[PDB]
Design an enzyme around this catalytic site. Structure first.
Site, PDB file in Angstrom:
ATOM      1  N   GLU A  13      63.927  16.343  94.812  1.00 39.70           N
ATOM      2  CA  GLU A  13      64.503  15.181  94.136  1.00 39.70           C
ATOM      3  C   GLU A  13      63.757  14.790  92.871  1.00 39.70           C
ATOM      4  O   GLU A  13      64.325  14.080  92.038  1.00 39.70           O
ATOM      5  CB  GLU A  13      64.545  13.972  95.087  1.00 39.70           C
ATOM      6  N   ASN A  14      62.502  15.207  92.724  1.00 34.04           N
ATOM      7  CA  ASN A  14      61.696  14.824  91.575  1.00 34.04           C
ATOM      8  C   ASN A  14      61.725  15.839  90.457  1.00 34.04           C
ATOM      9  O   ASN A  14      61.009  15.675  89.469  1.00 34.04           O
ATOM     10  CB  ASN A  14      60.262  14.516  92.013  1.00 34.04           C
ATOM     11  N   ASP A  71      53.705  14.151  94.778  1.00 30.10           N
ATOM     12  CA  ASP A  71      55.074  13.870  95.185  1.00 30.10           C
ATOM     13  C   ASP A  71      56.004  15.023  94.863  1.00 30.10           C
ATOM     14  O   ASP A  71      57.179  14.813  94.554  1.00 30.10           O
ATOM     15  CB  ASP A  71      55.607  12.594  94.537  1.00 30.10           C
ATOM     16  N   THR A 106      56.383  12.352 100.775  1.00 32.05           N
ATOM     17  CA  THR A 106      57.466  12.436 101.743  1.00 32.05           C
ATOM     18  C   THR A 106      57.032  13.295 102.924  1.00 32.05           C
ATOM     19  O   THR A 106      56.354  14.318 102.733  1.00 32.05           O
ATOM     20  CB  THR A 106      58.772  12.974 101.109  1.00 32.05           C
ATOM     21  N   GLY A 134      69.593   5.503  90.372  1.00 33.20           N
ATOM     22  CA  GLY A 134      68.830   5.583  91.615  1.00 33.20           C
ATOM     23  C   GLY A 134      68.215   4.232  91.914  1.00 33.20           C
ATOM     24  O   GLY A 134      68.002   3.420  91.013  1.00 33.20           O
ATOM     25  N   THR A 135      67.924   3.994  93.195  1.00 31.23           N
ATOM     26  CA  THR A 135      67.420   2.687  93.600  1.00 31.23           C
ATOM     27  C   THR A 135      66.584   2.837  94.859  1.00 31.23           C
ATOM     28  O   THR A 135      66.935   3.607  95.757  1.00 31.23           O
ATOM     29  CB  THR A 135      68.580   1.695  93.818  1.00 31.23           C
ATOM     30  N   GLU A 163      69.144  16.267  89.587  1.00 24.71           N
ATOM     31  CA  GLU A 163      68.044  16.687  90.424  1.00 24.71           C
ATOM     32  C   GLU A 163      68.264  18.070  90.986  1.00 24.71           C
ATOM     33  O   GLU A 163      69.376  18.434  91.385  1.00 24.71           O
ATOM     34  CB  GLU A 163      67.977  15.780  91.665  1.00 24.71           C
ATOM     35  N   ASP A 192      58.942  11.174  88.076  1.00 25.04           N
ATOM     36  CA  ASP A 192      58.396  10.295  89.081  1.00 25.04           C
ATOM     37  C   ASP A 192      56.923  10.593  89.273  1.00 25.04           C
ATOM     38  O   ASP A 192      56.536  11.482  90.022  1.00 25.04           O
ATOM     39  CB  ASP A 192      59.191  10.310  90.380  1.00 25.04           C
ATOM     40  N   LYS A 223      58.758  17.472  95.426  1.00 25.16           N
ATOM     41  CA  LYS A 223      59.926  17.601  96.285  1.00 25.16           C
ATOM     42  C   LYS A 223      61.123  17.818  95.361  1.00 25.16           C
ATOM     43  O   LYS A 223      61.052  17.476  94.184  1.00 25.16           O
ATOM     44  CB  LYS A 223      60.129  16.358  97.162  1.00 25.16           C
TER      45      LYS A 223
END
Ligand SMILES: C[N+](C)(C)C[C@H](O)CC(=O)O
Length: 340
Positions: free
Chosen positions: A160-161, A156, A191, A40-41, A117, A174, A158
């Site tokens: 994706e975490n 945070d 987000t 990831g980036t 994820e 994260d 969500k």
């Protein structure tokens, strides 16, 4: 709450505080690891699969560029992230194994979770059944009970975490926005789809924002899309602050009722933030089938086990351009990151 829970949380806080007050530092170095693949980036960092050259263990190494952290006003957030992660211990939080810094970067070396994820799995399957969503939700409820008792706000939540591990359980990753807060805090972060109204409205907000985000997550898991969608952030924000949500007809009555109480725009009326705290959530009819202790002990068979070939398999993550991990010959931003 049963004395059993009170005593558990008292010990949890004692152990957290000892590590919080004397953080670990400088517990590995970059050349102890081989780089395998970028997982990831983002604008100031990346996560890379690495392998320890002596033990052969795989890890997820988060690399933050000190100069970009400074430019994007993330100094305190990065210091929060590492100080918190090195101090916490809970079954559904990813473990930090090592941390260190060099002339250019900060490094957090965490356990690698090859299942990927939740976001990917949710988008692949479409939506989770209520039992499946509930299994994940219960883990978040317990995780927030733990974090909030330590005076930590996560900020945070969500899909994706939330990584899915080899037993099908969640590991929260994260901690970039996590913060130790007694009382209120003010930073705009998170987000758009997951932000509580009081964040959008620039108020001093508290741990109730995490309970709002849990409402968003549960809705998204069960519907396949979040409750407040739109093409521009400002249109999302208008929906969030409006006090209106529509539910799919396939939602159970119990699910709708819980979500109305989590997605409560008035933070003083929101579940998780009332006098009974987390117990208003744990005792809600939607959770009637949940054995909270069995979830904590990881004794419940999970809804699914991600498919993966072994601890080094990257198939559940996607492909990114592979860029250098360059380390300047000169120290950058040393003063700002002294405590890391
Ligand atoms: C083989 N050994 C024990 C070195 C590593 C395990 O496969 C776990 C890992 O790869 O992270």
């Amino acid at each position: 709450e049963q004395e059993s829970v009170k005593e558990f949380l008292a010990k949890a806080k004692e152990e957290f505080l000892k590590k919080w007050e004397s953080p670990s530092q400088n517990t590995a170095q970059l050349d102890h690891f081989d780089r395998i693949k970028t997982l990831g980036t983002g604008s100031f960092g990346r996560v890379m699969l690495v392998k320890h050259k002596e033990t052969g263990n795989h890890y997820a190494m988060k690399i933050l560029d000190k100069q970009k952290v400074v430019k994007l006003k993330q100094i305190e957030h990065t210091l929060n992230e590492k100080r918190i992660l090195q101090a916490v211990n809970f079954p559904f939080l990813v473990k930090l194994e090592f941390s260190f810094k060099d002339n250019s970067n900060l490094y957090m070396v965490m356990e690698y979770v090859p299942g990927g994820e939740m976001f990917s799995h949710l988008r692949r399957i479409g939506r989770f059944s209520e039992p499946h969503a509930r299994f994940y939700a219960a883990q978040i409820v317990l995780t927030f009970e733990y974090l909030h008792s330590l005076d930590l706000i996560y900020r945070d939540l969500k899909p994706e975490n939330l990584l899915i591990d080899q037993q099908g359980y969640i590991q929260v990753t994260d901690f970039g926005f996590a913060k130790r807060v007694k009382g209120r805090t003010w930073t705009l972060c998170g987000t758009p789809e997951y932000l509580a109204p009081e964040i959008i409205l620039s108020k001093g907000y508290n741990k109730a924002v995490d309970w709002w985000a849990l409402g968003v997550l549960i809705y998204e898991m069960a519907a396949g899309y979040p409750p407040f969608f739109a093409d521009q952030p400002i249109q999302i924000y208008e929906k969030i602050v409006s006090g209106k949500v529509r539910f799919p007809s396939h939602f159970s009555s119990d699910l709708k009722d819980l979500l109305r109480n989590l997605l409560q725009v008035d933070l003083t009326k929101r579940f998780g933030n009332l006098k009974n705290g987390v117990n208003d959530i744990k005792n809600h009819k939607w959770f009637a089938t949940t054995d909270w202790i069995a979830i904590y002990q990881r004794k419940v068979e999970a809804p699914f086990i991600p498919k993966f070939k072994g601890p080094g398999d990257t198939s559940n993550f996607d492909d990114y351009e592979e860029e250098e991990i360059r380390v300047s010959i000169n120290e950058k931003c040393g003063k700002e990151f002294t405590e890391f």
